[PDB]
Every structure is written in structure tokens, then in C-alpha cells.
């Protein structure tokens, strides 16, 4: 049990670290998805707004 605990603790710590890595990667995806949407629909949708004007004339 001491080893099972160290192992479970390694697993708990692993999961805390894995969660930490994923806390970081979820935030990176939360920020990257955010940034990509924020820049991508905001720019390309803006480019389609610009289409409204670009294709006028």
C-alpha cells in the first residue's frame, strides 16, 4: 500500500500534472480557439463585409 500509494500518488500527481499540462493546453486551446475565432471570423467575416463594399461598383 505504501507503494500502491506512491504509485497512486504518482498517478494522482501524474493526473495533477497531466491535468496541469492540460489545464495549460485547455487554456491554450481556449485562447487559441478564441484567438483563431477572434481573428478568423472577425477578419474573414470582415473580409465578407468588405465584400459587401469590395464588390460594389
Amino acid at each position: 500500500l505504501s507503494d500502491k500509494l506512491k504509485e497512486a500518488e504518482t498517478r494522482a500527481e501524474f493526473a495533477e500534472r497531466s491535468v496541469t499540462k492540460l489545464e495549460k493546453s485547455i487554456d491554450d486551446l481556449e485562447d487559441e480557439l478564441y484567438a483563431q475565432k477572434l481573428k478568423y471570423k472577425a477578419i474573414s467575416e470582415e473580409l465578407d463585409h468588405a465584400l459587401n463594399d469590395m464588390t460594389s461598383i
Partner: protein
Amino acid sequence: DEDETTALVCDNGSGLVKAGFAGDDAPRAVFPSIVGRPRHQGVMVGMGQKDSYVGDEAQSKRGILTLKYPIEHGIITNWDDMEKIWHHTFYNELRVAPEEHPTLLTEAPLNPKANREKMTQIMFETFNVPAMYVAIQAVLSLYASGRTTGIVLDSGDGVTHNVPIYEGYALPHAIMRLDLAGRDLTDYLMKILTERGYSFVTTAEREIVRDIKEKLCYVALDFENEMATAASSSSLEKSYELPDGQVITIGNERFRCPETLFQPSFIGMESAGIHETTYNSIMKCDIDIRKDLYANNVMSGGTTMYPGIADRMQKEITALAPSTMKIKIIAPPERKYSVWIGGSILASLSTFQQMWITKQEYDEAGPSIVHRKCF
């Protein structure tokens, strides 16, 4: 126990030997690749006492034995000791006579040919196996991992080969063999523990350091940051209890041992490490292969157990790897046992039953036959 004449599967390294019956998901027997011999004069009589001890016998009575292993940096150097290991593993532990079962043995593709010839010869001439096959360790690692495509970084005890495979095909020009493995990591640790005041040079002592490494060490996601703290604070030391009741505490040495995987210069090797070979094997693969191998770099064999290694490796490869592309390392539970598991998967395929060297072809040609029949 087995109720059918299935193939036997056995992975053999400089570390341990894993064996069992094809069709399972685990070896049924695992033994150290060790044959032990007494180094003392007997005085009492009627004490039993063997001339040689094998596997678990070698470790159980090790207090007065010198312990040697038959495999060095991927090859068999002592066929007699491999015969003892297999004899014990197959007949005493698995309770099987290979005479009634085909046997599957393994090696990476650049392994010197003498190794494949010896594996073939021992099983055909001392065990009378009806059939043989030598499989590629990378092939078996990908089967165990659920892949047909990926790079197998077999960071075992002897040698690391880092072999890339795409759609089940070899890409041999890209195999970046590396002279760094778990046995060297043990030696690094013995020297650094000597600096701490604990000399470990004799067989019992060498076994202790190997055990310390396996239970206490980790890679460290950030080496320098982990060291800045580990070198400054005792709170990062882990206490290991030595067999005689004494203890040793290990601090930044706890990670400096596996760091050799990222710093081979630690043992005098002219290499940057396992992440460098991971990168070079993929770098030399076809430009239209790379995307599938980068998303599927595969850990296999041992040393992958480091709870620091999973993030350490993906960070190190991602740093060298191309943008746009998804870069990922597969670090499956079938680790440290992936070759045996892959062996079971291969050995049990219906499509593999035509791949066997029979004990007819073997005697007509001799053991060099494996060089033409397996791969």
C-alpha cells in the same frame, strides 16, 4: 497454462526476458536476463548449491553470486546463457516444451545479423522447435500500440534504434541507431551517487543502483528549472532504503540520470539524445510520410516509465518539428511490454502462419536461413 499448440513468444534484451503464449495480452513469465555464479568457497556440505543460477534464482541467491547478462547493446554474446534462460522460462515457469510449439523471437532491423542467427539456432537445435521466426521490434511495438504507422523509439536497456515505419513498410535509410540505453543511465547514476558518498561497484551494489533508478528517477519537464530547485532544497530528495536497512537520499541526481537521454554527453557520447534521433529518423523520411509519423511518434520498451518523459519528449520534438502539423507522442500502457504484446499479436495472426521457418528448411540450410526468411 495452455490448451493449444500456439506459438510461443519471447522478447530478449540486456535487461529482462518476457515470455508467454501467443494470443494473450501479457507474458506469463518475466525473468531478468541473468545467469549467476558463486564466487566463494563452500565449507558446509549437504547444502545443495548450484553451479549456476538463472533468472529469479540468480537474483534470490545473489548475495554470494556474480551476476552476468548474455545480451550487449542489442546482441547475444553468450548463447549458452540464453539457452539456460529460455530453458528455465519455458520448461519451469511456463511449463511448455517448445518442441510442440512454433517460437517467435525479436530484434530491431539494424541489429547485427549474428543475433538473428543465434536466436534461430538455439531454438532449433537445443529446444527442437518445429518452427521459427524473428520479428522486428518496431513491428511488434506498432502492433501493441494499435498503429501501422509511427516511429518506434525503443529506449530499452541495451540500445535505442528509433525505427520509422509507414503503412507497415520499413524506411531503413532513416534508422538512427543510438548508443544510449538504460544500462548506461545506471552507470551514470553509480558515478553521481559516488560523488554523494555512496560507492556502488560490486554485483549487489550494481543491482541496487539499477533498482534505485527504476523506482526513484524521472526525466524533468524542465531540466534547468527542476535542478535549480532540486539543487537548492532537500524537499525534492527521495529516500531509498538499501537492502541492509541503511538509506540513501537522492536529489537532483534523481533526474540527472535520465537527463542523459537528453544529454548523452553525460556518459561521454557524441549525441544530443533520444529526442534528437526521434527527430532525425523522421527528418529523413519522405516529405509525404512525415505528417503521419509526427502525429504518431511512439514510445516503446522501458525508460519510458519516467513520469517526466511523457511531457519532456513531446516538448523536445515539438520544438524541432514543423508548424501547422499536429505533433504528438504516443505513450501507451503497453510500454515496457509492447514488444512481447506485439509478438503475441503477430504470432497469432492467420496471415503470419505462412511466415515460419520450418524445422526442415532450417536443417537443410542452417541458421543463416533466418537472413533470407524473416526480413
